[PDB]
């Protein structure tokens, strides 16, 4: 079990609204985080408020975890701090249309 | 006393001015928190200066506990760091109308 | 000497420019701090560079230490951290007229 | 090994949108950092969203390491806090056409 | 060598371009820092990107330290954090006019 800081990004967009923060089988059983960093926007983003949510479950109900919200016109980007995603995590988009440039650290852990 | 981190997100609007950060009663007992991330707006929200506020007691007298400030034509989000809220605690809005998308994380303990 | 987290808040208008941050003298004796958090507007603040400084003494001479400056058309809000005042601490607007609405945190000693 | 805090900037425009974070051989061995503080901006910036990105290796493949975003009609400045670079390591812009000027503290060990 | 937590603030305009944060020489023995806050902006500043700059020596070279830049159209503050200069150091500035307020914490030692 030796680290690796893998950093990571993904794209949230109209075909890609829905998205997974996902570590493979073998490797799950590790201690594995997601040090959250910055979100950027592409072409298509359209001038809303775009918002980015975490989806994970509620006792055996559905869950959106509100991560951040932006819109080009007056807040192309957004400040999150402090929060470490264990995977596997669902990214969404409640409000917007993407596309969303989402960065951070993939702190991983290998044999 | 077995911790869970479950996110937490609520609504102050015009029929929902004040709000309740609560605990169950059987659950009041141990350690409970709060840690504040986050607000986004909604489609009804005034475009002037909303205030959210916490309402607890003075030794016998109301209070207003200034927590955040906002106005979507200039400040759409507002950024507040270090607060843990241990409920029961109010929400409140000072000034504006809403809604007004309060997220955070309700650290719970349970048995 | 057992703490005490009172919340507090303050006005610095144009007849209430200077302002104390003050605990009473048979508590003066305790570790009183302030931490500050955020400053909003009222109704007459002036569309203009609100300065707000510290005022307390230079081995003599008077002094004024800036803490923060706003200004509704683009800075309706300003984001000050990591400042703890021990009372008593004078409030003064450099620039501007008020009223801006001081928040922070009394952690407060008491008998 | 001795410690140096030497300051450090660096511009990427048009014929400089690769560089390179780079120590010299002799003393890579030894522990080096760049803690990453600041951007800002020239006069043949265009306005549209610049995108500083960290250019390192994917366990074989090319790889792009979101940074920094800005654009000056209303984004003239990004604030990034907590990324410590250990050269060599590429600088490049994504998005844009420069010039920018990148600055951060070269921690850097002579014998 | 007991410990004083001066506060400390200066002007940087267009006659005050460059100045010196120092301690006098029967004090400079001791351990002396500056733990930089804030700058605010005055009358006469040019609406661009003023730029302040630390000066001090590279193995006998000249050196322009960044520190902060903003400009008020935009910026009209800027927010740096993590900065503790040691006297002598020389402010200076790049770009722009000013004046600038700059001000921290001279934290000195006094026998």
Chains 1, 2, 3, 4, 5 share one sequence.
Not at 32 to 45: N, P
Not at 47 to 63: P, R, W
Request: one cysteine or more; glycine letters at 6%.
């Amino acid at each position: 079990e030796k680290p690796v800081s893998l950093i990571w990004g993904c794209e949230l967009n109209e075909q890609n609204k829905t998205f997974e923060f996902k570590v493979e089988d073998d490797e799950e059983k590790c201690e594995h985080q997601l040090a959250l960093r910055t979100v950027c926007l592409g072409d298509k983003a359209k001038d809303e408020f775009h918002i980015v949510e975490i989806v994970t479950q509620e006792e055996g109900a559905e869950k959106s975890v509100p991560i951040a919200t932006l819109k080009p016109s007056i807040l192309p980007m957004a400040t999150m701090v402090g929060i470490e995603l264990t995977p596997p995590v669902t990214f969404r988009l409640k409000a917007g249309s993407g596309p969303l440039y989402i960065s951070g650290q993939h702190v991983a852990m290998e044999e």
